[PDB]
Amino acid sequence: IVEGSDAEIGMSPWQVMLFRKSPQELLCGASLISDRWVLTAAHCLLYPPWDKNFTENDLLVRIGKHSRTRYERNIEKISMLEKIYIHPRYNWRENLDRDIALMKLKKPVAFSDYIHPVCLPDRETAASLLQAGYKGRVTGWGNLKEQPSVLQVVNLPIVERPVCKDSTRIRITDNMFCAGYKPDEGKRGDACEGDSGGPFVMKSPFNNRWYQMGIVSWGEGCDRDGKYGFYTHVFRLKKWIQKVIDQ
C-alpha cells in the first residue's frame, strides 16, 4: 500500500496473508469469508507470465495478523489448504478477467478478536454501494512504493467506468472496476505489489456491516498520476462463489 496509514489492531480481521513455504515469503493478500473459506485473486495462485503456478502444499494462510514479519504467537492462526479453485473462465492471457480464486482450509478456524469473516455483497448492496465517488478501503502488507512493518490501510474512491477505460490501453471488462484519486484531487494512494488478492471493502450505512466488493487485481505501477487500481467485481462473480461453496 502506497500512501496509507498503519492499520489499528483488529481493523481488518478478515485480512489474510498468503504465505509461501520456501522461501518463507509474502505472496498475496486474501480474505476470510467463513470458518473454512478464504477468498483471493486467481493471479496469486496462477500467473504464467511471472512464473507462478502454486499447488496446495506450497502455501499457507495466516489469519489474524498485524505485523508483516513477526510470528504473532497466541494471535495469528496459520492454516493449511485442502483445495485451490481458480475460476474456470479466468483470463490470465489478456486482462485478468475473472481474477478470483477460493481456497478451502484443511480445518475450520476459530474466530477471535483478530479473526472474523467479512460479508459478501447481495445484488442490492452492490447496486447501492458500487458507485463512482463512493469510497472503499484496501489493506495489506505489500510495498509502500513502486516495505511496511505493519498492515497498511488506504481509503480510495471508486472511479467512473469511462475514466477507468481512458486511463489504460488494456481492455477493461464488466467483471472489474477501478478506484483511486484523480490527478487534481488532493489525496493519493494505491495498492502495490504484495497487496494483490486482498480485499476492497465497503461499510454499509444501512446495517453497519463490512462488505467485500472488490479483490485487488492489477495496476500499471503503484500510485501513478492518471492511473488507477483495478479490482475484481465480487458481486458479479458471486454465483460462481456459492456454486463452489455448495459443492
Next chain:
Amino acid sequence: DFEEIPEEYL
C-alpha cells in the same frame, strides 16, 4: 525478512 514459523505448520 520473515521470522521463522513453528515447523508444525511446515
Next chain:
Amino acid sequence: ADCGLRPLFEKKSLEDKTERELLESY
C-alpha cells in the same frame, strides 16, 4: 450470519479512525 461486524469495533460499538471518510462519501 455474524459477518462484517468486527470484534473490536462494531461488536463494541467503537469507530475506527477513518471509517467516517467512507460513510461521508455515500
